[PDB]
Design an enzyme around this catalytic site. Structure first.
Site, PDB file in Angstrom:
ATOM      1  N   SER A  96       0.792  -1.190   0.000  1.00 47.79           N
ATOM      2  CA  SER A  96       0.000   0.000   0.000  1.00 47.79           C
ATOM      3  C   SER A  96       0.837   1.257   0.000  1.00 47.79           C
ATOM      4  O   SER A  96       2.003   1.292   0.364  1.00 47.79           O
ATOM      5  CB  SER A  96      -1.149  -0.002   0.990  1.00 47.79           C
ATOM      6  OG  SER A  96      -2.343   0.041   0.240  1.00 47.79           O
ATOM      7  N   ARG A 119       3.348  10.949   6.295  1.00 47.32           N
ATOM      8  CA  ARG A 119       2.245  11.912   6.208  1.00 47.32           C
ATOM      9  C   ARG A 119       1.847  12.257   7.644  1.00 47.32           C
ATOM     10  O   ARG A 119       1.249  11.441   8.340  1.00 47.32           O
ATOM     11  CB  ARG A 119       1.105  11.309   5.451  1.00 47.32           C
ATOM     12  CG  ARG A 119       0.110  12.327   4.947  1.00 47.32           C
ATOM     13  CD  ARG A 119      -1.210  11.670   4.616  1.00 47.32           C
ATOM     14  NE  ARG A 119      -1.214  10.781   3.465  1.00 47.32           N
ATOM     15  CZ  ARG A 119      -1.954   9.681   3.268  1.00 47.32           C
ATOM     16  NH1 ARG A 119      -2.805   9.198   4.191  1.00 47.32           N
ATOM     17  NH2 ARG A 119      -1.835   9.050   2.096  1.00 47.32           N
ATOM     18  N   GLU A 172      -8.366  -0.001  -8.277  1.00 49.04           N
ATOM     19  CA  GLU A 172      -8.375  -0.739  -6.996  1.00 49.04           C
ATOM     20  C   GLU A 172      -9.449  -0.154  -6.090  1.00 49.04           C
ATOM     21  O   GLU A 172     -10.088   0.832  -6.474  1.00 49.04           O
ATOM     22  CB  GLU A 172      -6.998  -0.793  -6.308  1.00 49.04           C
ATOM     23  CG  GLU A 172      -6.478   0.579  -5.848  1.00 49.04           C
ATOM     24  CD  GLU A 172      -5.371   0.478  -4.904  1.00 49.04           C
ATOM     25  OE1 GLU A 172      -4.913   1.432  -4.345  1.00 49.04           O
ATOM     26  OE2 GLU A 172      -4.924  -0.736  -4.702  1.00 49.04           O
ATOM     27  N   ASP A 184      -7.533   7.600   1.751  1.00 48.76           N
ATOM     28  CA  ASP A 184      -6.767   8.794   2.078  1.00 48.76           C
ATOM     29  C   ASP A 184      -7.209  10.060   1.299  1.00 48.76           C
ATOM     30  O   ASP A 184      -7.301  11.158   1.864  1.00 48.76           O
ATOM     31  CB  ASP A 184      -5.222   8.568   2.008  1.00 48.76           C
ATOM     32  CG  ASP A 184      -4.754   7.998   0.669  1.00 48.76           C
ATOM     33  OD1 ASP A 184      -5.456   7.833  -0.315  1.00 48.76           O
ATOM     34  OD2 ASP A 184      -3.474   7.699   0.660  1.00 48.76           O
ATOM     35  N   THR A 185      -7.430   9.887   0.006  1.00 48.84           N
ATOM     36  CA  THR A 185      -7.798  10.985  -0.837  1.00 48.84           C
ATOM     37  C   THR A 185      -9.096  11.579  -0.363  1.00 48.84           C
ATOM     38  O   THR A 185      -9.347  12.762  -0.595  1.00 48.84           O
ATOM     39  CB  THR A 185      -7.869  10.646  -2.326  1.00 48.84           C
ATOM     40  OG1 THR A 185      -8.933   9.766  -2.628  1.00 48.84           O
ATOM     41  CG2 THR A 185      -6.520  10.196  -2.872  1.00 48.84           C
ATOM     42  N   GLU A 214     -11.046   3.516  -6.685  1.00 49.48           N
ATOM     43  CA  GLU A 214     -10.005   4.179  -7.485  1.00 49.48           C
ATOM     44  C   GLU A 214     -10.227   3.925  -8.953  1.00 49.48           C
ATOM     45  O   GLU A 214     -10.281   2.771  -9.386  1.00 49.48           O
ATOM     46  CB  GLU A 214      -8.639   3.650  -7.054  1.00 49.48           C
ATOM     47  CG  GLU A 214      -8.234   4.119  -5.645  1.00 49.48           C
ATOM     48  CD  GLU A 214      -6.808   3.843  -5.247  1.00 49.48           C
ATOM     49  OE1 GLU A 214      -6.423   3.968  -4.115  1.00 49.48           O
ATOM     50  OE2 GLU A 214      -5.964   3.457  -6.187  1.00 49.48           O
ATOM     51  N   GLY A 261       2.066   2.567  -2.377  1.00 46.62           N
ATOM     52  CA  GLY A 261       3.141   2.428  -3.329  1.00 46.62           C
ATOM     53  C   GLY A 261       4.438   1.806  -2.856  1.00 46.62           C
ATOM     54  O   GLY A 261       5.450   1.961  -3.526  1.00 46.62           O
TER      55      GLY A 261
HETATM   56  N1  LIG Z   1      -1.786   0.452 -14.261  1.00 45.68           N
HETATM   57  C1  LIG Z   1      -1.585   1.654 -13.945  1.00 45.68           C
HETATM   58  N2  LIG Z   1      -1.583   2.622 -14.899  1.00 45.68           N
HETATM   59  C2  LIG Z   1      -1.356   3.951 -14.644  1.00 45.68           C
HETATM   60  N3  LIG Z   1      -1.116   4.441 -13.469  1.00 45.68           N
HETATM   61  C3  LIG Z   1      -1.188   3.531 -12.491  1.00 45.68           C
HETATM   62  C4  LIG Z   1      -1.438   2.199 -12.657  1.00 45.68           C
HETATM   63  N4  LIG Z   1      -1.392   1.594 -11.444  1.00 45.68           N
HETATM   64  C5  LIG Z   1      -1.105   2.536 -10.564  1.00 45.68           C
HETATM   65  N5  LIG Z   1      -0.971   3.751 -11.132  1.00 45.68           N
HETATM   66  C6  LIG Z   1      -0.650   5.041 -10.464  1.00 45.68           C
HETATM   67  O1  LIG Z   1      -0.037   4.810  -9.231  1.00 45.68           O
HETATM   68  C7  LIG Z   1      -0.863   5.299  -8.108  1.00 45.68           C
HETATM   69  C8  LIG Z   1      -0.699   4.335  -6.927  1.00 45.68           C
HETATM   70  O2  LIG Z   1      -1.128   3.059  -7.456  1.00 45.68           O
HETATM   71  P1  LIG Z   1      -1.820   2.017  -6.433  1.00 45.68           P
HETATM   72  O3  LIG Z   1      -2.199   0.830  -7.261  1.00 45.68           O
HETATM   73  O4  LIG Z   1      -3.074   2.586  -5.889  1.00 45.68           O
HETATM   74  O5  LIG Z   1      -0.784   1.749  -5.278  1.00 45.68           O
HETATM   75  P2  LIG Z   1      -0.992   1.347  -3.742  1.00 45.68           P
HETATM   76  O6  LIG Z   1       0.340   0.866  -3.321  1.00 45.68           O
HETATM   77  O7  LIG Z   1      -2.060   0.338  -3.806  1.00 45.68           O
HETATM   78  N6  LIG Z   1      -1.446   2.702  -2.979  1.00 45.68           N
HETATM   79  P3  LIG Z   1      -2.752   3.019  -2.067  1.00 45.68           P
HETATM   80  O8  LIG Z   1      -3.780   3.724  -2.922  1.00 45.68           O
HETATM   81  O9  LIG Z   1      -2.234   3.807  -0.902  1.00 45.68           O
HETATM   82  O10 LIG Z   1      -3.298   1.567  -1.657  1.00 45.68           O
HETATM   83  C9  LIG Z   1      -2.241   5.332  -8.743  1.00 45.68           C
HETATM   84  O11 LIG Z   1      -3.093   6.204  -8.005  1.00 45.68           O
HETATM   85  C10 LIG Z   1      -1.900   5.851 -10.141  1.00 45.68           C
HETATM   86  O12 LIG Z   1      -1.584   7.257 -10.079  1.00 45.68           O
HETATM   87  N1  LIG Z   2      -3.200   4.893   1.407  1.00 46.77           N
HETATM   88  C1  LIG Z   2      -3.103   4.233   2.720  1.00 46.77           C
HETATM   89  C2  LIG Z   2      -3.304   5.199   3.834  1.00 46.77           C
HETATM   90  O1  LIG Z   2      -3.486   6.390   3.623  1.00 46.77           O
HETATM   91  N2  LIG Z   2      -3.254   4.724   5.067  1.00 46.77           N
HETATM   92  C3  LIG Z   2      -3.358   5.480   6.280  1.00 46.77           C
HETATM   93  O2  LIG Z   2      -2.078   5.658   6.766  1.00 46.77           O
HETATM   94  C4  LIG Z   2      -1.905   4.957   7.972  1.00 46.77           C
HETATM   95  C5  LIG Z   2      -0.477   4.535   8.044  1.00 46.77           C
HETATM   96  O3  LIG Z   2       0.457   5.593   7.892  1.00 46.77           O
HETATM   97  P1  LIG Z   2       1.917   5.448   8.462  1.00 46.77           P
HETATM   98  O4  LIG Z   2       2.609   4.613   7.407  1.00 46.77           O
HETATM   99  O5  LIG Z   2       2.483   6.886   8.548  1.00 46.77           O
HETATM  100  O6  LIG Z   2       2.038   4.888   9.865  1.00 46.77           O
HETATM  101  C6  LIG Z   2      -3.043   3.951   7.984  1.00 46.77           C
HETATM  102  O7  LIG Z   2      -3.277   3.546   9.333  1.00 46.77           O
HETATM  103  C7  LIG Z   2      -4.152   4.708   7.299  1.00 46.77           C
HETATM  104  O8  LIG Z   2      -4.829   5.589   8.218  1.00 46.77           O
HETATM  105 MG   LIG Z   3      -3.885   0.136  -2.844  1.00 50.26          MG
HETATM  106 MG   LIG Z   4      -4.473   3.439  -4.781  1.00 52.30          MG
END
Ligand SMILES: Nc1ncnc2c1ncn2[C@@H]1O[C@H](COP(=O)(O)OP(=O)(O)NP(=O)(O)O)[C@@H](O)[C@H]1O
Ligand SMILES: NCC(=O)N[C@@H]1O[C@H](COP(=O)([O-])[O-])[C@@H](O)[C@H]1O
Ligand SMILES: [Mg+2]
Ligand SMILES: [Mg+2]
Ligand SMILES: Nc1ncnc2c1ncn2[C@@H]1O[C@H](COP(=O)(O)OP(=O)(O)NP(=O)(O)O)[C@@H](O)[C@H]1O
Ligand SMILES: NCC(=O)N[C@@H]1O[C@H](COP(=O)([O-])[O-])[C@@H](O)[C@H]1O
Ligand SMILES: [Mg+2]
Ligand SMILES: [Mg+2]
Ligand code: NA
Ligand code: NA
EC number: 6.3.1.21
Lengths: 389, 389
Positions: free
Chosen positions: A159, A360, A276, A283-284, A264, A161
Site C-alpha cells: 500500500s 504523512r 483498486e 486517504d484521498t 479508485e 506504493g
Molecule cells: N496500471 C496503472 N496505470 C497507470 N497508473 C497507475 C497504474 N497503477 C497505478 N498507477 C498510479 O499509481 C498510483 C498508486 O497506485 P496504487 O495501485 O493505488 O498503489 P498502492 O500501493 O495500492 N497505494 P494506495 O492507494 O495507498 O493503496 C495510482 O493512483 C496511479 O496514479
Molecule cells: N493509502 C493508505 C493510507 O493512507 N493509510 C493510512 O495511513 C496509515 C499509516 O500511515 P503510516 O505509514 O504513517 O504509519 C493507515 O493507518 C491509514 O490511516
Molecule cells: Mg492500494
Molecule cells: Mg491506490
C-alpha cells in the site's frame, strides 16, 4: 437500531484494526455517537489511539493475537483500517458471529491485489489495465515481455506504493524485481500495463441499509507512491460519471457489506477504468473533512451501524494537500501554524509519535470558488508549516 | 504558533475544566491538531474525558485541588468549560504565569452577574435590563419593589435558572427569597426588570489574532431553564444586527483575551439589549456543528491557539434540538436511532455515564431550505430517539 452508552454495560463497541489518520476520524465519529472505541495497531500512540477509550498494540498479522484481543474486548464491530491484517482470522471470527466491516470476504479480497483484480476483471468484467502476476524473477520477466513497456510492477500485498516501480526499459528489470521483493510480505507481484488517463479519481461509495450512495468524484494527484493533493468535485462528462458510478456500484455490492468504499478509477474522456478499491475510508477522501456535511469517516460509521445515509451534501469546490515532511525525529513540532489556517483554510495534524524519513503527518484543507484555487490554497498552507524535530 | 505532538515531550497541552458535551467538542478540535488534552470534571467518564488523552476527577471549586491538578499536568492552556470553577485560583494561576482562556478576569467577571452587569451597563455604557442589588429578605423585598412586576430573581451565583424566580406577585416573595438560597452557594441576589423582546439571540463572537469576527445570529427557545431548540441564522434587521455586533465587540474587547464568547441579547425591533455573556462556547451554539465551516468549538480553539479566523462560512438555515429525557439509569440506551438521522440530519450522543432526573444526553442537528423547516427536522429527529434506562 439501538446504541448503548460508551463505557456502560450496554455499550456499542467498535474495534479499529489500524489506528492511522483515517481511523482517527472514524474514532471521532464513533465517539460523537457515544460509541465505545478500542484502537489497535502495531505501534503505540497511533493517531486513533489518542481519541479512543482504550488501545492495544499487537501484531495484527498474527491471527492468534487478533483472536486474543477480540476475545478480550468483545467488540460488536471490527473495523479494519489498514490492509495488513490477518484476514483469515477475520473470516473465522465473522463466522463465530463477529461483525467485520464491511465484511470479512471484502477484506480478504482487497488485501491481495490478485484477489480483487481477478474478481473485478474476470468475475465482474470491469475494465482494468492489462495485468499479469509473477512469483519468480523469470516469470516476472516473461510477464513484462507480454505486458510491454512501460509497465508498473507492484507486490500483491502493499500500500501507498511500497515496492513499486514504473518500468520503462528492460534495464530496470533486475532492480525492479528485487525492489518488489523488498516490498511485500517478502512474494508474488502484479505487472500492469500503464493506463494513460486524462486524470484519476476516487469515487467514495457508501453501501448502506438505504442503498448505494455516491460522493461527488474526488480527483487526486499521486507522486512517488503518495497522494499529494485531492479535490472535489472533479469534473467529468455525464457519461463518464454514470460509467464510474456503475463500476463502483458493481464493486461494492460484489465485495459486500455496509460501509464506505474508496473506488479508485482512471478516466479517459468518457471511458472509465477500474484500478483498486479501499473497503474502508480512503486517504484521498480526507478532502471530505471540509467538503461535505458528512465526511467519508462519518459516512462509514453511519453505514456500518446499519443506519440510513439519506443523502450527502457537497459544499462546493475543495481540496486537501498533504503535510509530508522528511526527517528523523521522535519529538516533531509544527511552527508557523498561524500562516497555515484562516479563511476557508484548515489543517489537521495527526499526532504520529515519530518520523524516520518521509511520513504523512498532517493535511491541509481548503475551499474556494474553483478546485484550482482550492488546490493552491491547500498546498500553500501545507507548505507554510515548518516541520521540525 | 508552534504546536508540538501530543504525547511527545514538546506536546502542546490543553486542560479542560469541565468535560460536558461542549468540552467534548473542544477536545475533538484540539485532537484534530495533535494537541494534548487533559479533561477535568467532578465526576468520572464525563463526555470530554472519552476523547481526551487523560482525565482527572476533582472538585473544581476547590482551588487547592485546582492548583494541584494544574501544576501536575503543567498545561499551556487552561480552558474553562463551566461556570462553577474556582475563579480566584484561575486569577492566581494566571498571575503565576498560566494561560487562562480567554483570560482569568473574564472568567471571574462573568461568574458574577454583579461584576458583569455593572461593567456592561455602567462602564461600557450598554443597554440592559433594569435592576438593583439586595443582600436581605428586607433588602430583597425593598428591591423587587423598586423593580416592580413582573421581574426576575437570580442568585449572583446562579446558572440554568438555578435559584431563579419569575415574580409577578408579592405572594411569591415568601418562596423566592428562599429559593434564592436553595441554589447558588446556599447567599445574595439580583433583581431584574423585564424586557419584552421580540426574540432572543446568541451572538457567538470570536476574538482572535486577526480581530473580532461574528457568527450569524443564533435564535433559540428556552424552557424550564433549558434551551430546547436553536437556529441559525435568526432573521433580524441589518440595523439590529449592526447594533448587536457593536455591543458584542465592546463586551468581548472589554473582557479581554482570545476565545469564542456567547453574547446574549434581546431584540425588540431595531433595538438590542445586552443580557449576559459566556466567555466560552455556548450550548445554543451547538447548531454550528452542522451550520458552519468551523463550529464554535473549532473557533474557540483556533482563537485561543493564537491563530487567525479570517472568516466564518454559514451553510444556510440550520437548527439544533436537544435530546433531554428524564429518568434514572446508569445504563442508558438509545433506540430507533435510524429515524433520527438521514439527509441533512445528524445526532450527537454524549456518552454521559448515567442520569437521575432531567439531563441533556445528546442533540439532533439539521439543515433545510428554511429556518422553520430546519427546526422541525431537528425537533422531529430528537423526538424519534427512544431513551431507555
Ligand atoms: N496500471 C496503472 N496505470 C497507470 N497508473 C497507475 C497504474 N497503477 C497505478 N498507477 C498510479 O499509481 C498510483 C498508486 O497506485 P496504487 O495501485 O493505488 O498503489 P498502492 O500501493 O495500492 N497505494 P494506495 O492507494 O495507498 O493503496 C495510482 O493512483 C496511479 O496514479
Ligand atoms: N493509502 C493508505 C493510507 O493512507 N493509510 C493510512 O495511513 C496509515 C499509516 O500511515 P503510516 O505509514 O504513517 O504509519 C493507515 O493507518 C491509514 O490511516
Ligand atoms: Mg492500494
Ligand atoms: Mg491506490
Ligand atoms: N431581563 C430579562 N428579561 C427577559 N428574559 C430574561 C431576563 N433575564 C433572563 N431572561 C431569560 O432567562 C433565560 C435564562 O436566564 P439567564 O439570564 O441566562 O440566567 P442563567 O441562570 O445564567 N442561565 P444560563 O443562560 O444557562 O447562564 C434567558 O435566555 C432569557 O430567556
Ligand atoms: N447551559 C450550559 C451547558 O449546556 N453546559 C454543558 O453541560 C455540561 C453539564 O451537563 P450535566 O449537567 O448534564 O453534567 C457542561 O459541562 C457543559 O458542557
Ligand atoms: Mg450565564
Ligand atoms: Mg443565559
Ligand atoms: Na459486516
Ligand atoms: Na489567556
Amino acid at each position: 437500531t439501538l446504541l448503548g452508552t460508551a463505557l456502560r454495560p450496554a455499550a456499542t463497541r467498535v474495534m479499529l484494526l489500524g489506528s492511522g489518520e483515517l481511523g482517527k476520524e472514524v474514532a471521532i465519529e464513533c465517539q460523537r455517537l457515544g460509541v465505545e472505541v478500542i484502537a489497535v495497531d502495531r505501534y503505540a500512540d497511533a493517531p486513533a489511539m489518542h481519541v479512543a477509550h482504550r488501545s492495544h498494540v499487537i501484531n495484527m498479522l498474527d491471527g492468534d493475537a487478533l483472536r486474543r484481543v477480540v476475545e478480550l474486548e468483545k467488540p460488536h464491530y471490527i473495523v479494519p483500517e489498514i490492509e495488513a491484517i490477518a484476514t483469515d482470522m477475520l473470516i473465522q471470527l465473522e463466522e463465530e458471529g463477529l461483525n467485520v466491516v464491511p465484511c470479512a470476504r471484502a477484506t480478504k479480497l482487497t488485501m491481495n491485489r490478485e484477489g480483487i483484480r481477478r474478481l473485478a476483471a474476470e468475475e465482474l468484467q470491469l475494465p482494468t489495465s492489462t495485468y499479469r502476476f509473477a512469483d519468480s524473477e523469470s516469470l516476472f520477466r516473461e510477464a513484462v515481455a507480454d505486458i510491454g513497456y512501460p509497465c508498473i510492477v507492484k507486490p500483491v500485498m502493499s500500500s501507498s506504493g511500497k515496492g513499486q516501480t514504473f518500468i520503462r526499459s528492460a534495464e530496470q528489470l533486475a532492480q525492479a524485481w528485487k525492489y518488489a521483493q523488498q516490498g511485500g510480505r517478502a512474494g508474488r507481484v502484479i505487472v500492469e500495463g500503464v493506463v494513460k488517463f486524462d486524470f484519476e479519481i476516487t469515487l467514495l461509495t457508501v453501501s448502506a441499509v438505504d442503498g448505494v450512495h455516491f460522493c461527488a468524484p474526488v480527483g487526486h494527484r499521486q507522486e512517488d507512491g503518495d497522494y499529494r493533493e485531492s479535490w472535489q468535485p472533479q469534473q467529468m462528462s455525464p457519461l463518464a460519471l454514470e460509467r464510474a458510478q456503475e463500476i463502483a456500484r458493481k464493486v461494492v455490492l460484489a465485495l459486500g457489506g455496509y460501509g464506505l468504499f474508496g473506488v479508485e478509477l482512471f478516466v479517459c474522456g468518457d471511458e472509465v477504468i477500474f484500478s483498486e478499491v479501499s473497503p474502508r475510508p480512503h486517504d484521498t477522501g480526507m478532502v471530505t473533512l471540509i467538503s461535505q456535511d458528512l465526511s467519508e469517516f462519518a459516512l462509514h460509521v453511519r453505514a456500518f451501524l446499519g443506519l440510513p445515509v439519506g443523502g450527502i451534501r457537497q459544499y462546493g469546490p475543495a481540496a486537501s494537500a498533504v503535510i509530508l515532511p522528511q526527517l528523523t525525529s521522535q519529538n516533531v513540532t509544527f511552527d508557523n501554524v498561524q500562516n497555515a489556517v484562516g479563511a476557508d483554510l484548515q489543517i489537521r495534524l495527526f499526532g504520529k509519535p515519530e518520523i524516520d524519513g518521509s511520513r504523512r503527518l498532517g493535511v491541509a484543507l481548503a475551499t474556494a470558488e474553483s478546485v484550482v484555487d482550492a488546490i493552491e490554497r491547500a498546498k500553500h498552507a501545507a507548505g507554510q508549516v515548518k516541520v521540525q524535530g
